[PDB]
User: Fold this.
Amino acid sequence: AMGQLQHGIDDENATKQTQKYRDAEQSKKTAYDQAVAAAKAILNKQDKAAVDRALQQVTSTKDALNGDAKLAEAKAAARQNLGTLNHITNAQRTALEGQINQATTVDGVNTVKTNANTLDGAMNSLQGAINDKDATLRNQNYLDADESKRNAYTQAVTAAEGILNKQTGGNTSKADVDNALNAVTRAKAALNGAENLRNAKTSATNTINGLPNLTQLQKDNLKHQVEQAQNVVGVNGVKDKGNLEH
Amino acid sequence: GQLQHGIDDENATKQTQKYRDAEQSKKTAYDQAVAAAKAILNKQTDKAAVDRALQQVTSTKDALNGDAKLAEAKAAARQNLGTLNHITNAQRTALEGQINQATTVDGVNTVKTNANTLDGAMNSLQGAINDKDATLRNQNYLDADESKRNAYTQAVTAAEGILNKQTGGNTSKADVDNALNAVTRAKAALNGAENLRNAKTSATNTINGLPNLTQLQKDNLKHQVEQAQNVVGVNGVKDKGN
Assistant:
């Protein structure tokens, strides 16, 4: 079998380039490597039985390489983990599931498992950023916010909801999810209804105080009405009432 | 003013390990707190909202737990290190030092990975000399060239010195492998078997030609030659030629 042994030696580099070897357990990779080295030495010496024992060991350690078995295990682990991500959309899930099935190395799988958790984490964040959507919309801070600001917020959440919908949401990327998240955060933190009301009450109060058609107590009444107003239009309604008073 | 400080201090915060190794949620919570802070600042012409925003940048920042993550990785690494049984006390001590010096979570995990692969190489090296006694008392070794026997004995002894948990030094993974390759190559190099066959053939030829015996008195000495079990044996029958 002299030739078979030479074959085992020739196939070393090739075998070492394979995933079966690459991801095999260290000890198995080493045993194979040591068998090849042993074979070379034995082949050099030329106890024909020595050549066969050498061949047997190269063939045995090689078959023992279990990188492929380790790949199946890794993929199994990834699929198990993927199913625990409650925030990614179906489209995102199938893409990940696909990348898991398409992965050729243990490192690739884990990398896919890593991106899946990151993406889910981001989706979770985007979901949290808009969990107070309805409440924010009914609040005076949103309602009396500059129209451009109110529109920016409604838009942000709209986009967010589209990305979030598990049934129709596409395979949005991590970068876009983050872009969507920032959109909601900054748009919401921009709502200035609270500030518009404070300024509204100030200008309305100062304007009333300076009106020529009002007695002082009439100004007090109106000023108090401004004080109790809960929103901008409420304030301006009082101011107008003051301008028509005679 | 206090809020802009917390904002202009975001990057000097993202460089730190406490941020980089913090949980994803903790990191984003911080980034978004800053994003909001800027916007909340832009809507000013509600100073409380400026405090609330301040409180959030500070709260989220202090929440960053990259430092705890590191301490966790270290504990894990040390725990795993204590489960290895083949690295030498010297290597173990060196590994512990590496765990202490590490400054990032990935740095710690790399030490754990190296520790395990080292322990593996060590175990493989041990397995390489398990058949030492058997080899030493075998004809393939005994009749092997002087230089080849030395190579195997040098490689084995060197390996045993590397393997002793109590006396072995802090041998690197690569050096463990070289030592391993030396034993394997040296043992496979033993040519006592070849020397014997070379001697039988050499003796047989000498036989076939020595002028003072008989096709009949030495067709059988050749037989004795072929039946010898070692080099001295072949040599033993040979002088039965002069």
Observations:
- Chain A is about 80% helix and 0% strand.
- Chain A touches chain B at residues 26-27, 30-31, 34, 37-42, 44-47, 50, 54, 117-118, 121-122, 124-125, 129, 149, 178, 181-182, 185-192, 194-195, 198-199 (CB under 8 Å).
- The CA atoms of residues 159 and 180 of chain A lie 7 Å apart.
- The radius of gyration of chain A is 36 Å.
